[PDB]
Amino acid sequence: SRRKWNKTGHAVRAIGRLSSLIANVYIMADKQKNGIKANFKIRHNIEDGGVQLAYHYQQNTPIGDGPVLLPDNHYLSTQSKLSKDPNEKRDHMVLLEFVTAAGITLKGEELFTGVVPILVELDGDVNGHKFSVSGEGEGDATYGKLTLKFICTTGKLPVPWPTLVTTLVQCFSRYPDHMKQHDFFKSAMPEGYIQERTIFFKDDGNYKTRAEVKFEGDTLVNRIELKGIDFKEDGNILGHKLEYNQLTEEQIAEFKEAFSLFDKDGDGTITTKELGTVMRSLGQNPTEAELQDMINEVDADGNGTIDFPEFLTMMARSEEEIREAFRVFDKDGNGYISAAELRHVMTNLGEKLTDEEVDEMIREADIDGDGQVNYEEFVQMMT
Amino acid sequence: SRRKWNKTGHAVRAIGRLSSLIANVYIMADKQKNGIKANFKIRHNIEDGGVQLAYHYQQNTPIGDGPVLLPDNHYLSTQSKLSKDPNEKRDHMVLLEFVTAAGITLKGEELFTGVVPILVELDGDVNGHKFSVSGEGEGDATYGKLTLKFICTTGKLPVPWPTLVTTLVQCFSRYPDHMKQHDFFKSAMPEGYIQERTIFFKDDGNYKTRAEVKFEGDTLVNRIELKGIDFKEDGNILGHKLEYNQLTEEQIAEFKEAFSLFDKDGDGTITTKELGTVMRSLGQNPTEAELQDMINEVDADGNGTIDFPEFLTMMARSEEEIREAFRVFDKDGNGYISAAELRHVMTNLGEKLTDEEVDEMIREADIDGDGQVNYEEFVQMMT
Ligand SMILES: [Ca+2]
Ligand SMILES: [Ca+2]
Ligand SMILES: [Ca+2]
Ligand SMILES: [Ca+2]
Ligand SMILES: [Ca+2]
Ligand SMILES: [Ca+2]
Ligand SMILES: [Ca+2]
Ligand SMILES: [Ca+2]
């Protein structure tokens, strides 16, 4: 009996474990409307345990008359991080999001090659409670990245912030090279698109939304109207019973800097060619098969290259990792990292620093004043 | 300077982190010899820190005259677990291994459809130290699985057990359906093959091995001669400085039992069809896209189905997982799992048990004697 509970417990948990690993945004063409439709589920964590489901139905149509790209079926994958600004007294949300497209094997776009300013404006009415939200920040589609801050401009927000995240610019998603012809969102720009949703909160009310997303000069603007009906006074939404919120923003900034040493052409992905070049410049000799297998281990989407969200996952997932790192730096294996050896590694990686900056790095690590870094000093610096 | 150490530390560690995630056995055809060649590296952990590399070079040739299958390039992926038998006074090793083939996108074999007995015999000479090893157990290629116990028949083994693992039957590897034409090993049977290696222990001696692997009646036999030269008296090998050794064997047996509830045709893999059937019989309604995405999350080899080693990884990688499992069992959501509800889940999963056995499961969990299982009782049973 204790064995039967184990066997059937494992199976039921396997299914849970399989299901909670996914919340993709499934996109399909809508030819008759010269646009797309999407559907997906969001699971909002309830503060003291449990999940509140939010079922999303989406349609998008172009605003302008020029041709747009209508895709084959595919999906977006997202990771969101919510935080608070310690200096802000107004009701507010700070948001960092990474989004990439996947699901397919093997002029608007030029508007998105660099960092683009974003404005967001929402006017809402949930069960009669009128409120407004204003948001500003920037998007960098090279990295599938959004960073934004939102304020409630009418006082206290009558709903939880996490319930507004999906409503509050999919044109900033990263489409990999093999899927460029499937990016409706950027194809619609600069004239833009209309995006409409219905969002059903299980056992509670629904939101209906309509938004215009378009360029106004060089700023990508998302202007939205939202109406919520049939919400329960003491449900998870009007009762504020959902969790609000991981690495820090500055920890993520460090990993971007590291990622740039491999991504030498700045296209947002590390190929086998780029990884091999960095490995060989440090004295190592992987085969092409090994490079492919290395990438394949962290390759979310099977396109054969490592983008920034992939790289992040990997570096957020040891004593022995640090010993091997030491060996890479200690070229002649005598037990000490010399300023010459450090300068060499920096050059090999592509980092440009003066001899003075390299000595400053030695100084930061050099506890015993011999002007070299030993293994224990290196550990202290790595931890 | 503290930021520069972070950035360049991250890059160097990324490479370490990328490299240590792989130790594949790379196979190529050797047409002139009507066989294959392989090369790979093994990293043996040194007891107090560090790794001892062991560079492997391999050739295999058929013993008999009938046609064999010569493959496209591809690799095997392995996981080994070493243990000791608490009842055995002789110098010995207990081994459980899982091996699958990958590296390609999208009559001998019939000898391997079930469980096959294995005998292993080795005679060796390392730096003049003559010794022998005998091993017995079984292989089940459906699951890529080997289970064996080895004894040193000459007394104390003069080398570490982990150094003999690769020498001590790749015919038990699991080749997935799309790679059946690339399985040299099974194609050579029953007459068998000769397998030869050179194994270079970095900074130390080398092993040369020659073995005959073939059927003798219904037993797969591996008979080996090994010669080791140029070893250092105080190196990691003759000095026994390597680590010997994870889930238990009986924990792994439980997961096999669970896996069988999904793998209803016993072929060793879970398709999307099989996962959906089990999910729907428990009242859930995934789309085909969701099923594919679920599998793809644990899919080591991109063949679109879940084999047993994949399933194991996943279940060895929470309070909320158990709450959702409870909900699956508590069909009517009243807070209590009834014997009727339990019987229903068992039937839905395919488990056959009498009503008496189901009441015994209730009894094992039922702390307060009401003949039903509540949430707290279910937690106790799951932990
Ligand atoms: Ca690049
Ligand atoms: Ca990729
Ligand atoms: Ca040195
Ligand atoms: Ca020093
Ligand atoms: Ca099956
Ligand atoms: Ca698979
Ligand atoms: Ca019930
Ligand atoms: Ca009870």
Side-chain angles (χ1 to χ4, degrees), chain A residues 208-331:
Chain A
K208 296 195 179 59
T209 70
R210 186 180 181 283
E212 298 186 10
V213 184
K214 67 181 172 104
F215 283 89
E216 300 196 332
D218 304 288
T219 294
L220 190 279
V221 186
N222 179 20
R223 293 202 169 79
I224 311 134
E225 66 179 309
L226 180 152
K227 185 146 174 83
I229 70 189
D230 303 333
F231 283 96
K232 289 174 158 79
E233 277 142 283
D234 193 41
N236 291 323
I237 288 60
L238 291 179
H240 300 277
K241 309 177 181 188
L242 302 175
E243 282 197 351
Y244 182 78
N245 62 12
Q246 324 193 61
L247 302 161
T248 155
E249 301 128 305
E250 39 88 70
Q251 224 152 19
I252 294 164
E254 301 191 349
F255 292 125
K256 193 177 161 225
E257 278 200 86
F259 185 84
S260 308
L261 301 169
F262 301 90
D263 178 25
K264 287 182 189 301
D265 65 0
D267 81 337
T269 201
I270 301 168
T271 59
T272 60
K273 134 111 175 139
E274 284 169 330
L275 183 49
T277 291
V278 176
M279 288 179 73
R280 289 179 279 278
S281 80
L282 304 162
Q284 294 166 219
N285 286 109
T287 71
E288 205 84 335
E290 292 173 323
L291 293 170
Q292 287 160 15
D293 290 345
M294 297 175 51
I295 289 184
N296 287 18
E297 213 71 10
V298 287
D299 197 9
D301 62 4
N303 85 333
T305 71
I306 304 172
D307 57 40
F308 186 59
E310 293 161 355
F311 187 85
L312 266 191
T313 294
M314 176 189 66
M315 302 300 287
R317 78 182 203 68
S318 174
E319 188 207 335
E320 306 308 305
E321 172 167 282
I322 291 152
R323 193 113 51 28
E324 171 65 11
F326 183 73
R327 284 169 206 142
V328 175
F329 288 88
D330 170 23
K331 287 256 156 247

Side-chain angles (χ1 to χ4, degrees), chain B residues 29-135:
Chain B
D30 189 349
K31 326 299 221 331
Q32 288 286 301
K33 293 182 154 164
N34 200 26
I36 59 172
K37 62 167 141 17
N39 67 281
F40 52 106
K41 334 185 172 180
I42 304 292
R43 304 188 179 174
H44 297 296
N45 282 340
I46 303 168
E47 194 63 51
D48 281 300
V51 295
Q52 168 62 74
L53 302 179
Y55 305 99
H56 286 64
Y57 295 88
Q58 176 183 336
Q59 82 187 359
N60 299 54
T61 324
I63 290 170
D65 294 323
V68 302
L69 292 176
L70 310 160
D72 292 345
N73 293 358
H74 73 278
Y75 61 81
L76 310 177
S77 138
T78 67
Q79 46 179 346
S80 299
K81 182 265 270 335
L82 289 60
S83 59
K84 300 291 189 182
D85 171 358
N87 293 323
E88 176 60 69
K89 301 186 166 181
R90 294 165 302 182
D91 202 354
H92 72 286
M93 169 176 75
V94 179
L95 185 60
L96 174 65
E97 171 180 336
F98 297 98
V99 183
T100 64
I104 298 182
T105 76
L106 242 163
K107 320 204 299 195
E109 167 128 35
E110 4 200 354
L111 293 169
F112 290 90
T113 58
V115 171
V116 168
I118 299 175
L119 178 60
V120 184
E121 300 180 338
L122 180 152
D123 291 321
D125 177 342
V126 174
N127 274 32
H129 287 287
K130 297 280 193 312
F131 61 98
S132 294
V133 166
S134 195

Side-chain angles (χ1 to χ4, degrees), chain A residues 1-19 21-22 24 26 41 48-51 75 251 254-255 257-258 261-262 275 278-279 282 284 289-290 293-295 297-298 306 311 314-317 320-325 327-329 337 342 345-346 349 351 353 357 360-362 364-365 373 378 381-382, chain B residues 1-19 21-22 24 26 41 48-51 75 251 254-255 257-258 261-262 275 278-279 282 284 289-290 293-295 297-298 306 311 314-317 320-325 327-329 337 342 345-346 349 351 353 357 360-362 364-365 373 378 381-382:
Chain A
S1 65
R2 222 165 91 198
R3 284 71 189 202
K4 326 271 223 192
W5 276 113
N6 281 347
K7 165 194 204 168
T8 51
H10 296 332
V12 170
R13 284 195 302 104
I15 283 154
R17 196 173 281 216
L18 279 176
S19 299
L21 275 146
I22 69 171
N24 297 326
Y26 295 105
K41 334 185 172 180
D48 281 300
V51 295
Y75 61 81
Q251 224 152 19
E254 301 191 349
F255 292 125
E257 278 200 86
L261 301 169
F262 301 90
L275 183 49
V278 176
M279 288 179 73
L282 304 162
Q284 294 166 219
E290 292 173 323
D293 290 345
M294 297 175 51
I295 289 184
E297 213 71 10
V298 287
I306 304 172
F311 187 85
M314 176 189 66
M315 302 300 287
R317 78 182 203 68
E320 306 308 305
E321 172 167 282
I322 291 152
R323 193 113 51 28
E324 171 65 11
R327 284 169 206 142
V328 175
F329 288 88
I337 312 167
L342 192 53
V345 174
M346 302 301 282
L349 302 165
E351 250 307 82
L353 306 177
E357 286 175 305
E360 278 308 291
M361 287 179 69
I362 297 294
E364 191 65 359
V373 182
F378 180 81
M381 205 60 255
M382 292 290 98
Chain B
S1 65
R2 222 165 91 198
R3 284 71 189 202
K4 326 271 223 192
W5 276 113
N6 281 347
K7 165 194 204 168
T8 51
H10 296 332
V12 170
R13 284 195 302 104
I15 283 154
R17 196 173 281 216
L18 279 176
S19 299
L21 275 146
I22 69 171
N24 297 326
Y26 295 105
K41 334 185 172 180
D48 281 300
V51 295
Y75 61 81
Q251 224 152 19
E254 301 191 349
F255 292 125
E257 278 200 86
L261 301 169
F262 301 90
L275 183 49
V278 176
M279 288 179 73
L282 304 162
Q284 294 166 219
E290 292 173 323
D293 290 345
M294 297 175 51
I295 289 184
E297 213 71 10
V298 287
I306 304 172
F311 187 85
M314 176 189 66
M315 302 300 287
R317 78 182 203 68
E320 306 308 305
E321 172 167 282
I322 291 152
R323 193 113 51 28
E324 171 65 11
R327 284 169 206 142
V328 175
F329 288 88
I337 312 167
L342 192 53
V345 174
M346 302 301 282
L349 302 165
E351 250 307 82
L353 306 177
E357 286 175 305
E360 278 308 291
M361 287 179 69
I362 297 294
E364 191 65 359
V373 182
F378 180 81
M381 205 60 255
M382 292 290 98

